[PDB]
Structure 1
Amino acid sequence: SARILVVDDIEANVRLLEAKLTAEYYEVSTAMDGPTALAMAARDLPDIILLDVMMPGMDGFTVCRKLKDDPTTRHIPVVLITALDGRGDRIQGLESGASDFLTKPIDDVMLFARVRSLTRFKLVIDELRQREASGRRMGVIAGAAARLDGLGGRVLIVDDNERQAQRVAAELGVEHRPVIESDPEKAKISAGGPVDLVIVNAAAKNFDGLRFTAALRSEERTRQLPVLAMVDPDDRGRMVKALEIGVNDILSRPIDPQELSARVKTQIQRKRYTDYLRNNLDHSLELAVTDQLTGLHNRRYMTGQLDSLVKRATLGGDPVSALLIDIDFFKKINDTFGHDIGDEVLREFALRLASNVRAIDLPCRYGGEEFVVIMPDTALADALRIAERIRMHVSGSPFTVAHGREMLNVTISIGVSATAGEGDTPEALLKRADEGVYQAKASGRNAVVGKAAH
């Protein structure tokens, strides 16, 4: 279910861990030092890396720093597993970018809980990386592939221990924008707003922090919001639960502020990376101008042009008209002959429309079975002629279908609309058009109806 790379200078360690992980059905590979490790990671792109710190030559902190400094590997969670146990070295490991820092001998129940958690989180990151990478024979821009810090960031602190909360707030205060909130019900609201990270106390006295987290996770709006939970280091059952319901990361009471700072930064920086991906995906769709199926222009492109043309109309320029065409009984077509045949009809209809209208006109795909034609410098009466012409052309001739094998009769209903002067707006114009289609429908279909200015 995951490819895990294990790194340690002692063979006994490597194969003991290996047997545990393959017993849980993971695909394990191994390296015996830093240099090797970095080569395998760059080549094989594993899902997780488990890493010794103390090794002859290049040590685990360095290895870790390099993995995060290459864009190919920056995204892979690293878990340090080591014999060291000083606070000093704990903090050095987290500051160098590791998700967790475990001290030998490790708790297997926590290791597997943690691994199952990381893989769950990597699911969405990886899909989005796949989505982007399918722009690669296209055009990227703007983005200079440049990272994205972990500083800044608005942090909500849900806690009913005033002493503890203020300490947490004082530490984050220098580098971040912290806000305290001891009411869980209010907190639910706040957490929807402008917030990058929530810190929740699982050992709160007046509410259950874990239930509160489950709450955030269940509602679609905040399922993605990172959550860092304060827990008791002696209560293993509760730590596993925390990971299982969906907590991104954990901290031991009493709160070490240097540990706190390191993990808050880690979490804010991963959440930003995944919002870079989401926005890049959405910016590239914005740039699309045609409808994939019919190759006519899409409605986004159309409404942009309609904005400009209607504004110019309102301030005294040329009038604009709109035709809104909707195919009759289109659902009956799909329900009888199948979706494929539905698409043959749509494609043919688009080519017929395009070629019975002037080049200066803007025909477009407006919805599933709806088409709009914008006609610059055209008034209501002419538009009605043009609509009539298209109606008679569509129904005057059957449609080829089932690639060649069969004909079909198709008819359309059309609503027609023209601009009405200074007060008019493109949404008003379109609304009059579909009031026309509605009456045309009601009149018995295969009909044109022009609704007038008010």
Structure 2
Amino acid sequence: SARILVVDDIEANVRLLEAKLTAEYYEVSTAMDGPTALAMAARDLPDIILLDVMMPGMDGFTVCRKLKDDPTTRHIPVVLITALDGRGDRIQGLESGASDFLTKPIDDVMLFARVRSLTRFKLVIDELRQREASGLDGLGGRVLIVDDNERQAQRVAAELGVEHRPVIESDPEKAKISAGGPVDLVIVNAAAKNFDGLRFTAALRSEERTRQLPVLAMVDPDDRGRMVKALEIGVNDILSRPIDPQELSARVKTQIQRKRYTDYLRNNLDHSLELAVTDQLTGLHNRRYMTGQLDSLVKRATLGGDPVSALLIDIDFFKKINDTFGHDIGDEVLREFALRLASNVRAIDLPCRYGGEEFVVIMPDTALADALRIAERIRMHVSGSPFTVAHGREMLNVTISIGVSATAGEGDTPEALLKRADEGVYQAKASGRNAVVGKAA
């Protein structure tokens, strides 16, 4: 279910861990030193890396620094597994970019809960990296604090305050609202006294708008069953009470960093979508592009200047087509119709794919009368000679219903102009169909 790379200088250690992991059905690979481990990671792209710290030559903290400083491996979660228990070493570990730091001998139940947690988050990131494939820092950023322990809430807020923008909130009902705004990370108290920390977190995950929002849980270290539960409901990371400030800073950074990379992918994918100007099926311009143009045209119209007209065209009985002859022939009806349209209207006009079975034509410098004439021309055109696709199907007979509209001086808006044409379409369909109906103020 995941490819895990195990690194450790004592073979007894590697063999043991390998056994436990392959017993839960992971594909395990191994390495006995730093250089080898870097090479394997670069080459094989494991889902997770489990890493000893003390080793001859290159040690785990360097290996781990190097993993994060290379763009290829940067995304791979690292877990340090080490005989070291000192706090100094723990902090050096997390500061150097590790997702967690586990002291030998490890709790198996915990390790698995944690591996499962990391693979669950890695699903969404990996699919985004694929989508981008077809075509950053952790300081600053706003951190909401949901604790009803005033004093402990204040130290967390004090510590974060130096490099971030912390905000406290004890009322959980309000914390659901604030969570919905521009928040980068939520810190929750799992051991709260006036509400259930985990339940509140579950609520955020369940809700669509906040499901990707990172959550960091403060948990009682002597309560394993509740930590496991937290990882299972969807917590990004766990902090033990009492709260180490340095550890806290390091884990917050890490999460805000990974969060920002995932928004960076989501934002690049939206940006590219925004540049795309055509409709793929039909090769006309898309709705987005038309509305952008319609906005500038209508504005210029209202400030005195060229009136603009709009035609809204809806293909009649377009389902019966798709139902009877299948969607493949439906796509052909739309493709042909698109070409008839484009070629029966001047090049300064702007024909586009508005919706599933709807098309819009924008006619600059055109008042309502000319627009009704243009529409009637187009109508007769589709109803006048059959479609090439209906040739051998004695069942097709493609007609359209058209709604026409024109700007009405200052005060008017694109939304009102398209809504007026929708009233036209509506009226054309109630008359019988295959009809043009205009609609003034």
* TM-score (structure 1 length as normaliser): 0.94
Q: Is the 8 A contact 2:82 2:102 kept in 1?
A: yes
Task: Describe the SS at the equivalent of 2:5.
Answer: strand
**Residue 433 (structure 1) shift:** 1.1
| 1:65 paired residue number | 65
| 1:212 paired residue number | 200
Deviations 1:201-232 (A, max 9, x none): 11112221111111111111111111111111
Q: Distance in 2 between matches of 1:126 and 1:249?
A: 19
Q: Distance in 2 between matches of 1:404 and 1:79?
A: 66
Q: Distance in 2 between matches of 1:426 and 1:192?
A: 31
**Residue 30 (structure 1) shift:** 1.0
Q: Is the 8 A contact 1:384 1:450 kept in 2?
A: yes
Pair 1:182–1:69, CA change in 2 (3 A):
same
Q: Is the 8 A contact 1:399 1:407 kept in 2?
A: no
Q: Distance in 1 between matches of 2:304 and 2:205?
A: 54
**Residue 402 (structure 1) shift:** 8.3
Deviations 1:49-69 (A, max 9, x none): 000111111110000001111
**Residue 193 (structure 1) shift:** 1.8
Q: Distance in 2 between matches of 1:172 and 1:403?
A: 72
**Residue 406 (structure 1) shift:** 6.4
| 1:77 paired residue number | 77
Q: Distance in 2 between matches of 1:398 and 1:251?
A: 71
Deviations 1:302-330 (A, max 9, x none): 11111222222223322221110001111
**Residue 424 (structure 1) shift:** 2.3
Q: Is the 8 A contact 1:160 1:205 kept in 2?
A: yes
Deviations 1:272-326 (A, max 9, x none): 1111111111111111100010000001111111122222222332222111000
Task: Describe the SS at the equivalent of 1:408.
Answer: coil
Deviations 1:394-440 (A, max 9, x none): 01122233896666211100011122223322222212111111111
**Identical positions, percent:** 100
Q: Is the 8 A contact 2:390 2:397 kept in 1?
A: no
Q: Distance in 2 between matches of 1:105 and 1:49?
A: 18
Q: Distance in 2 between matches of 1:448 and 1:225?
A: 50
Q: Is the 8 A contact 1:291 1:297 kept in 2?
A: yes
Pair 1:433–1:249, CA change in 2 (3 A):
same
Q: Is the 8 A contact 1:415 1:433 kept in 2?
A: yes
Pair 1:373–1:252, CA change in 2 (3 A):
same
**Residue 190 (structure 1) shift:** 1.6
Q: Is the 8 A contact 1:233 1:253 kept in 2?
A: yes
Q: Distance in 2 between matches of 1:411 and 1:405?
A: 16
Q: Is the 8 A contact 1:398 1:407 kept in 2?
A: no
Q: Is the 8 A contact 2:390 2:396 kept in 1?
A: no
Task: Describe the SS at the equivalent of 1:414.
Answer: strand
Query: Unaligned stretches of 5+ in structure 1?
Result: 135-147
The RMSD of aligned alpha carbons is 1.4
Task: Describe the SS at the equivalent of 2:355.
Answer: coil
Q: Which moved more, 1:113-122 or 1:16-25?
A: 16-25
Q: Which moved more, 1:359-368 or 1:399-408?
A: 399-408
**Residue 81 (structure 1) shift:** 0.4
**Residue 385 (structure 1) shift:** 1.3
Q: Distance in 2 between matches of 1:34 and 1:130?
A: 29
Q: Distance in 1 between matches of 2:306 and 2:246?
A: 67
Number of residues of Structure 1 aligned to a counterpart in Structure 2: 440
Pair 1:272–1:403, CA change in 2 (3 A):
farther
Q: Is the 8 A contact 1:400 1:408 kept in 2?
A: no
* 1:167 maps to 2:155: yes
Q: Which moved more, 1:66-75 or 1:414-423?
A: 414-423
Q: Which moved more, 1:195-204 or 1:118-127?
A: 195-204
Q: Is the 8 A contact 1:341 1:402 kept in 2?
A: no
Q: Which moved more, 1:202-211 or 1:77-86?
A: 202-211
Task: Describe the SS at the equivalent of 2:388.
Answer: strand
* TM-score (structure 2 length as normaliser): 0.97
Q: Which moved more, 1:316-325 or 1:72-81?
A: 316-325
**Residue 194 (structure 1) shift:** 2.1
| 1:368 paired residue number | 356
